[PDB]
């Protein structure tokens, strides 16, 4: 059945360890979880956890341009690179973080669990911006990001209660609290969302059958997750400084543009007329999309209209219409 897990970790670096545990051993953790001990994991799962004042940057971004570091450093904020796309956020115990993992994508049901979770037991009337955002007056209150693999999908996203609005702009080189709204908390608007996901997957049944219950896993001290070498490797390659502020490497040439799903920076050398190396920095939420793109450099293409051309050919992407716009880019620069 599905599953609810909180960790009462407050560590940035921490509580993205365990997602990525969680991610990379879903059909597994009936095992890791002290539950079962044969039967594999297929169902649901809902994560809830908080960080301290942070910054997650996002897996293709550049930290240089988010982030104003000497703010950060001075004000004692850590400083972290999530494996999803998007930009840079800011985290404090004023917010609180879900982590939906499923068998399939499912953005759109668990949104709306979330909204169905804000109009039942807290009369705030939502919308869901773009696919990613959540907005309650035209005004910023969530805001996901997402993963895929083989047979996992991973959306992950912030929701607003009580984050210190005003002091993001001084590490971040409109937003609504929740709180303007309501008499909202995190253990309650957490509490509401667990009701919400338990009775969204409780459909099929009858009531009439079936325990009105609810159940809560923690996992922040379960050793068989925390004390594990693939968790420690997560953890320590979060917290390792080459992966946080990525690569410095300067490039010979470097090209950028603002699409409407995120922007785009190459950067890359040209050596007897072949694209040797480079790199990209994004915005996007495509992250497959980008390494999709980033599959051009140390390959042996011609840089030429034509070759470039074949290559995009060559690709088959999740967008190809997000691939279409930027090959047309780049057959102009
Ligand atoms: O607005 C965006 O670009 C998505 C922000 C996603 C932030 C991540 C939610 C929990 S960790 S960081």
Redesign the pocket.
């Known amino acids: 059945g599905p599953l609810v897990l909180v960790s009462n970790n407050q560590n940035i670096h921490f509580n993205l360890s365990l997602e990525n545990f969680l991610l990379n051993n879903y059909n597994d953790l009936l095992k890791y979880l002290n539950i079962n001990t044969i039967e594999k994991f297929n169902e649901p799962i809902l994560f809830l956890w908080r960080n301290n004042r942070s910054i997650?940057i996002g897996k293709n971004q550049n930290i240089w341009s988010e982030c104003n570091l000497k703010n950060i450093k001075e004000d004692g904020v850590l400083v972290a690179r999530?494996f999803?796309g998007?930009?840079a956020?800011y985290?404090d115990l004023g917010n609180v973080?879900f982590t939906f993992l499923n068998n399939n994508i499912n953005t759109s049901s668990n949104f709306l669990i979330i909204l169905n979770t804000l109009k039942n037991h807290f009369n705030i009337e939502a919308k869901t911006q773009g696919r990613?955002?959540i907005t309650v007056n035209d005004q910023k209150c969530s805001?996901?990001?997402f993963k895929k693999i083989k047979d996992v999908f991973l959306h992950?996203?912030?929701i607003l209660i009580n984050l210190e609005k005003n002091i993001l702009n001084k590490y971040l080189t409109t937003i609504n609290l929740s709180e303007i709204n309501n008499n909202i908390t995190c253990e309650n608007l957490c509490i509401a969302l667990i009701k919400e996901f338990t009775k969204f997957y409780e459909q099929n049944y009858n009531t009439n059958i079936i325990p009105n219950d609810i159940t809560v896993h923690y996992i922040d001290q379960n050793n068989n997750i925390t004390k594990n070498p693939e968790f420690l490797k997560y953890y320590n390659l979060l917290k390792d400084w080459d992966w946080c502020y990525g690569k410095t490497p300067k490039f010979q040439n470097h090209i950028w543009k603002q699409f409407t799903f995120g922007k785009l920076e190459l950067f890359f050398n040209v050596s007897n007329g072949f694209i040797k190396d480079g790199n990209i920095f994004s915005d996007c939420?495509d992250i497959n999309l980008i390494d999709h793109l980033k599959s051009i450099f140390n390959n042996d293409i011609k840089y030429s209209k034509e070759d470039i051309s074949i290559f995009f050919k060559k690709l088959n992407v999740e967008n190809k219409n997000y691939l279409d716009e930027v090959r047309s880019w780049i057959l102009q620069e």
């Open positions: 997650i999530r999803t998007g930009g956020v985290h973080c990613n955002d805001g996901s990001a992950h996203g912030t939420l």
